[PDB]
Amino acid sequence: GGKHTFNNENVSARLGGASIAVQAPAQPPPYSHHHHHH
Amino acid sequence: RCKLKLLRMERIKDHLLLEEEFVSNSEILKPFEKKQEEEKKQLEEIRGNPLSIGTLEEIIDDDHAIVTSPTMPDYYVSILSFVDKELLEPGCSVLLHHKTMSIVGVLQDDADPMVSVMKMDKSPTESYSDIGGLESQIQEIKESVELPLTHPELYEEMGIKPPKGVILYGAPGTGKTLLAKAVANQTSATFLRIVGSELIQKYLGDGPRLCRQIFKVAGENAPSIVFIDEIDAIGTKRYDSNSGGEREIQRTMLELLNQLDGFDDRGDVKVIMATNKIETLDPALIRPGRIDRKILFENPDLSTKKKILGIHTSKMNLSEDVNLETLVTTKDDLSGADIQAMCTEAGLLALRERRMQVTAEDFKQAKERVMKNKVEENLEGLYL
Amino acid sequence: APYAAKLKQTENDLKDIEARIKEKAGVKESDTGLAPSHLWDIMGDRQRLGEEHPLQVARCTKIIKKYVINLKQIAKFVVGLGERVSPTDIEEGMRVGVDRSKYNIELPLPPRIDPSVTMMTVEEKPDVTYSDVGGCKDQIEKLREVVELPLLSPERFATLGIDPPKGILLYGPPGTGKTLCARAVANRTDATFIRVIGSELVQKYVGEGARMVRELFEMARTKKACIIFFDEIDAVGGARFDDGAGGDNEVQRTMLELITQLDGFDPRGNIKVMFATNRPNTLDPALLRPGRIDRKVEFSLPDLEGRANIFRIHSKSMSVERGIRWELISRLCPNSTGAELRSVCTEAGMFAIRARRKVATEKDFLKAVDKVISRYMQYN
Amino acid sequence: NVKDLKASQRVCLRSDSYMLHKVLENKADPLVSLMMVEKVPDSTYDMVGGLTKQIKEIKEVIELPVKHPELFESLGIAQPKGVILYGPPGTGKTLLARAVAHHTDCKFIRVSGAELVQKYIGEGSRMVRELFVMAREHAPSIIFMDEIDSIGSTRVEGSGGGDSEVQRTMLELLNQLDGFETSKNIKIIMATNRLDILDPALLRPGRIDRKIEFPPPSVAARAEILRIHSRKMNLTRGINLRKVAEKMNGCSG
Amino acid sequence: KRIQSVPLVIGQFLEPIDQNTGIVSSTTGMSYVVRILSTLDRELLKPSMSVALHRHSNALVDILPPEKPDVTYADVGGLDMQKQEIREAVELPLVQADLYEQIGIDPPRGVLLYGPPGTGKTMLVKAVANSTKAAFIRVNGSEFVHKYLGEGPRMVRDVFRLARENAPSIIFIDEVDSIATKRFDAQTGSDREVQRILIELLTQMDGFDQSTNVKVIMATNRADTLDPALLRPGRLDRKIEFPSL
Amino acid sequence: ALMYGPPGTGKTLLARACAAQTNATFLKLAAPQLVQMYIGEGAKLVRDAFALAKEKAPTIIFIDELDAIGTKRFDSEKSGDREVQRTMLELLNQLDGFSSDDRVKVLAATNRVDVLDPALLRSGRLDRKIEFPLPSEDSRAQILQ
Ligand SMILES: Nc1ncnc2c1ncn2[C@@H]1O[C@H](COP(=O)(O)OP(=O)(O)OP(=O)(O)O)[C@@H](O)[C@H]1O
Ligand SMILES: Nc1ncnc2c1ncn2[C@@H]1O[C@H](COP(=O)(O)OP(=O)(O)OP(=O)(O)O)[C@@H](O)[C@H]1O
Ligand SMILES: Nc1ncnc2c1ncn2[C@@H]1O[C@H](COP(=O)(O)OP(=O)(O)OP(=O)(O)O)[C@@H](O)[C@H]1O
Ligand SMILES: Nc1ncnc2c1ncn2[C@@H]1O[C@H](COP(=O)(O)OP(=O)(O)OP(=O)(O)O)[C@@H](O)[C@H]1O
Ligand SMILES: Nc1ncnc2c1ncn2[C@@H]1O[C@H](COP(=O)(O)OP(=O)(O)O)[C@@H](O)[C@H]1O
Predict the structure, then answer these.
(1) Of C162, C216, E36, E73, which one is least surrounded by beta carbons within 10 A?
(2) CB contact, 8 Å: D3 with chain C?
């Protein structure tokens, strides 16, 4: 009744994103006004 | 306890029921119609044994249509004209003949499994009068959730738009998760049991559609109730987050607060959220429109405790000398859940002396144990 | 010891009998069907094996004086025809029909129209109007002047000499009615509307969501005078950065399908845009540049006068005595939002129901405020 | 028959016809290796000495609700559902959970901390849930845990949340709707070296109904710790190992 | 025996379900149930082993099974007694065990080698392998640290999963003072994971495991910094020192 | 060429102009118009264009938001991480495949330069640059008029 094949391949890309990280050192100011400047 | 005569009535009625249905099935059934004789004899004649499944991106009148699907490529396909042809729509799901493709039937939902897990089938035995520690916190939400299924005239005569969604926070050990399993006993509508952590998945864009499922399935299956617990999992607070995982937590937080109130209305879906620390979380998910009130649980006072242990201890013998009424005198920094332990340890601490019914020594021998663990809250003693 | 011998087994007998019912009935399920035209099944089989085989779609790339194709999955052929017209009816581009056995062409069909975007159009018109809004009377005027007047009265904007703007943005704190005024204007549209679901732009296959963006507009400018309502673009229109983890890398590639499409080489005609936020600082500057956003609006909090006209909306359906004075309730509700008033109008009504009265009062409103807002000596 | 199929199970299909002819089991879950034990450890209660009162609380909570719990229905109280045991290192606490396995008759699961974490968003909180279901079908069952995923008294910032979300699901399982309605035979043990750092949440009764102090020993205490370690040594005659303890208090055990 | 000939096709056993039937998830991509044949072992299959299948049936057929240090204690310089102590700690327990059994004790587990650099620590340990022939795993402590959460303790647990497999085996770590130093507390998120590193390392030796590994050979430049909870006897009990000048 | 600088200095506009005044053809492609799901959908697309531009010559190319593909090397073995950059690897070989005899002339644009891969900036490929500034106050007078 049917002679064709299908050949289900992985022609599609894909991805899994949980790029979870730790540090975040971005920007500590301990001199918000330099604390008497002097 | 001689409740049995209120028990031997029903199993005999579970038996007479068992008497009826097999009898109702066994030859008092009357099968002769064209359905069992003609209908069901034809479908399996053309419907093969395997019926594949897929979707469809577009349709044409006169039994000509299209399919998409993972294992195979697309197709141009005909219809057999017994599917309620003026039903189906894009995005639907289908029943495809196997040797040749052909749209033959369509399913109702086929939504997802996990949503079909979280629903209730059983019913937890806990109830009101399993707790009696309080009077108001029970009430201040009950009138949101349990009357409108019974007594809604009182909300249309006064004629307003009732509330749909609350939150219940406070210090632990006080019976938050409890108070859900009570109301879910006596609701008459469906129910959903969740944690906010459940609904984040590794892949990029599986949550935000998941949250769009359950706020769909509850809508169609109205009336309905939802219960998120420890939602500070996912909805706590937002920041800019130069990262790639924290944001997929936000998209769920942002799609949720679209469902609860946005462009299109949700229906009759009554949320119940729980949490142990608000001020360290929850920016805008906590406002009216979404949650129209906010309940405060705290560690009990004196007079509540008089009713707490009385129901924990309505079964133990304890008949001698206890004088409960000065057992728990001050605040003592203990919740209703430090009660359940003390009724426990002082139950068996008797038993290890091979005595069953109890005295006070067995109690205070426990109370000294629990309270021992307490951190020195008055480690300061600086404030005379 | 007297009777408990029985209760421990008879109770554990129910479940034996209960599931004993599950082994009595069976199961029942359906999918579809029909009663009156119950005799469908004479035309089916004759319709089946005839000249109604299936096809396996593709789309051409070249018509060499034969007929190259490219399947959906990457497999490219070069083919011929049966009875379908070779030279004339076909051209490049279109969707087609190909056999399953030896790949001849047999039938065209039009270009693709994804479901999702048609799941994204709105057809039934909501109910609110600018008379149901809470008296933010100015900010609407900056809104509609973008949207409808360049579609109804362009004879003013054009003749004087101004090319109107074609893009707004809305920002204010929550509970303030950013989405309200936007569901409204769909009522008074006089053209179409779109409710973009942001959840469909972040699929887990690369370069896909962007495909949904551009098709969102190919159908728009096809249509005449479309407008669009995003919401919570803080998800999509987030800022940019460089990280060798960068797990938001993909969603950046989507939005670039947007901004390149909004301002470059004018695929746009008359389509306008609408946005909404609670975080208007983080989102990238490119999406708040003129050209893209020629206009933006601050739904700041209300004032006492405008605060009142919120009550007059949410109070009409209610049973209340004539003689309350709102100029307390407003005065006594400090800086707060549309919603936190709507909860108040409500909960004045609920405390009635807690006592089984039938009409509200003036105090029950006040007894609501202390419950919503929630003493101090160093001010008196 | 097509009604006894406990759904979401795992079966066979026939090539070219797609027809069922067998049934298989729910297991082959991904995390099983460290997630249970197929062969028991080797230790027992007389390999340990110096403390036995501590034991009596364990077998009071663990074994009685499992061995014959008809009793509690007479005593009119609730079964318990967990403990926790604290004290310095070098006392023999992780010893005991190796040793409890020998003499259970119910199975055993063990998770050092840091096996839960799996570096994606929800790969952790899917993993805890993949644990408890593996318990219930194999019921009854015991779990043993060194725990610092539950470290931190709920600090509030960015990427210390990714384990908190692995912490908070587990609190549900111990007193969820279903957990409190289901966690009747499942049981739990956990350990530590500190309890000045954890939440106050795990430390409630309803999740850990009692807790234990493992202190370092007396001198007469330690003497039995040596006889067991020396049972295979030769031990020439003129020994007073009641003294060696006193010449140096082993401040550990 | 015919079909047991070529051309076979590969796969990968997963698990059994019966005395005469198992399953496979081949390399071709899909998963298949399949029946083993007799005239074949069973003791050797349960893990994700390697296998061979019959193509059309997708049946099962038969099983199939499968750095170099060059130094020696004369190629090294002198360093006499330091050498003598690791021959006691490391060489004996691998080729001699009745020694430690009959006395009434158990072997010591690994050691550490403190003392200033450029001193023949690492090379000694290589020679030790070269005599005893056992496997060898060299690795550095600044590799266990990693920025993606949990991307470190996966490592420390992964090597032991194989350092048992190729047993008898040992390890060298040319630096551990980096990730090992006493700290009064962590007011930080990153440095807390350093504890999650260590506490698994400290867990693997002490928890239930095999006995042929003598894995840990901690190298460093000082020893006045480590956690005494790492020095709990059972973990490490043979301090070692080398010259400075 | 390349035209770096911030939003609103007249980048895309100017390419609307240069395509007009010159009596040659002109071409366009947003960068994300290149990237596509399937694992051979992009690279074939770009080998076509430049080849098509060697045909129909002389030509001009416009790449509007190069900040998408041109970031850096996002090292991985996943699908989605490879198929992206592998386009860039074709773009380079396309630039270094022809000469300054055949009369193409490519350019580009961006809002960013602290984000993209210097291999494009290597001597020969995209060398001449333009630091589109903000406008001085004299220029403010022209623009409004
Ligand atoms: N009034 C009361 N009567 C009886 N039990 C009480 C009462 N108040 C508190 N409890 C006890 O408190 C326990 C429930 O604690 P609770 O449900 O508040 O934890 P939880 O914070 O909800 O947990 P989670 O945060 O995971 O939801 C029950 O075991 C219950 O016995
Ligand atoms: N000005 C107003 N007049 C009357 N009702 C209002 C007003 N503003 C807000 N509301 C109430 O708030 C709801 C919508 O508020 P709004 O549009 O501010 O939500 P939102 O800001 O889109 O929410 P989010 O910030 O989470 O997106 C409506 O259902 C309405 O009941
Ligand atoms: N009473 C005892 N009998 C036998 N051995 C003991 C005893 N007390 C301590 N030990 C010894 O102590 C060691 C176990 O220490 P312990 O298990 O307390 O640390 P730990 O619990 O593993 O620490 P952590 O669980 O925090 O990693 C074993 O090597 C054991 O021989
Ligand atoms: N120097 C200029 N001369 C004339 N018009 C200008 C100038 N600078 C900006 N404009 C105006 O700004 C718009 C063009 O902006 P431009 O094309 O620079 O945006 P862009 O920087 O390309 O945005 P993106 O970089 O995100 O593509 C036009 O509408 C134009 O009227
Ligand atoms: N006593 C010695 N005999 C022979 N070679 C030595 C000796 N001491 C040091 N070396 C040399 O030092 C080098 C290795 O130093 P190494 O042990 O790696 O330093 P570290 O221990 O700090 O890593 C080798 O090349 C080796 O030749």
Answers:
(1) C162
(2) yes
Q: In what order do the strands lie in the sheet with C105-109?
A: C68-71, C58-62, C95-98, C105-109
Task: Measure E163 CA to nearest chain D CA, in Å.
Answer: 17
Distances (CA, A) of F16 to C152, E125, F19, F49: 31, 70, 6, 19
E206 touches ligand 3 (CB under 6 Å)? yes
Q: Is F11 annotated as a binding residue?
A: yes
How many other β-carbons are positioned within 10 Å of the β-carbon of residue B27?
Answer: 8
Contacts of E17 in chain D (CB under 8 A): 24-25
Q: Are the beta carbons of D226 and B198 closer than 8 angstroms?
A: no
E66 lines ligand 5 (CB under 6 A): no
Q: Which residue of D121, D159, D165, D197 to mutate against B (max B Cβ within 10 Å)?
A: D121
Nearest 5°: phi and psi at B119? Answer: -60, 160
| Residue pair E195/D163 in contact by the 8 Å Cβ criterion | no
Q: Which residue has the tokens 């004993």?
A: C20
Question: What element of type H or E holds E103?
Answer: helix E98-103
In eight-state DSSP terms, residue B37 is: I
State how far the Cα of F40 lies from the Cα of F42, in Å rounded to an integer: 6
Q: Can chain E be said to touch chain F, i.e. do they have 3 or more Cβ pairs within 8 angstroms?
A: no
- Interface partners of chain C (CB pairs < 8 Å, 3 or more) are A, B, D, F
Residue written as tokens 């009077």? Answer: B135
Beta strands in chain C (DSSP E): 58-62, 68-71, 95-98, 105-109, 170-171, 226-227, 271-272, 297-298
Alpha helices per DSSP H over B95-175: 113-118, 139-145, 153-156
| Partners of residue D113 in chain E, C-beta under 8 Å | 196, 199-200, 203
Record the tokens describing residue E146, joined without a space. Answer: 């990693």
Ligand 2 centroid to Cα of residue C130, in Å, is: 13
Query: Is the CB–ligand 3 distance for residue D110 below 6 Å?
Result: no
Measured CA to CA, the distance from residue F13 to residue C264 in angstroms comes to 8
Closest-CA distance, A38 to chain C, in angstroms, reads 34
Distance CA C83, CA C112 (A): 25
Residues 6+ apart with CB under 8 A from F100: none
In one-letter notation, the amino acid at residue C322 is R
Neighbouring CB atoms inside 10 A of B178's CB total 20
Amino acid, single-letter form, for residue B65: A
How many angstroms separate the CA atoms of E166 and E164, rounded?
Answer: 6
Say if CB B242 and CB B195 are below 8 A apart: no
Quote the minimal CA–CA distance from F105 to chain A in Å: 33
Contacts of B333 (CB under 8 A, 6+ apart): B299, B374, B377
Characterize E26-38 residue by residue with b for buried, 16 or more Cβ atoms within 10 angstroms of its Cβ, and e for exposed.
beeeeebbbebee
Q: Which residue has 């025809």 as its token pair?
A: C81
- E39 contact partners, CB below 8 Å, separation of at least 6: none
- Identify the CA nearest to C162 among candidates C170, C172, C150, C171: C150
- Give the angle D53-D55-D60 at the CA atoms, nearest 5°: 105
Give this entry's resolution in angstroms: 4.2
For the record, the structure tokens of E158 come out as: 């992964």
User: For chain C, what is the total number of helices (H) and then of strands (E)?
Assistant: 13, 8
Q: Which residue of D has its CA nearest to C22?
A: D3
Assess whether the C-beta atom of E79 lies below 6 angstroms from ligand 5.
yes
The total of other beta-carbon atoms located within 10 Å of residue B31's CB is 8
User: How far from chain centre, in Å, is Cα B67?
Assistant: 36
Helix (H, G, I), strand (E, B) or coil at C237: coil
F9 marked as binding residue: yes
Question: In Å, how far from its chain's centre is CA E238?
Answer: 20
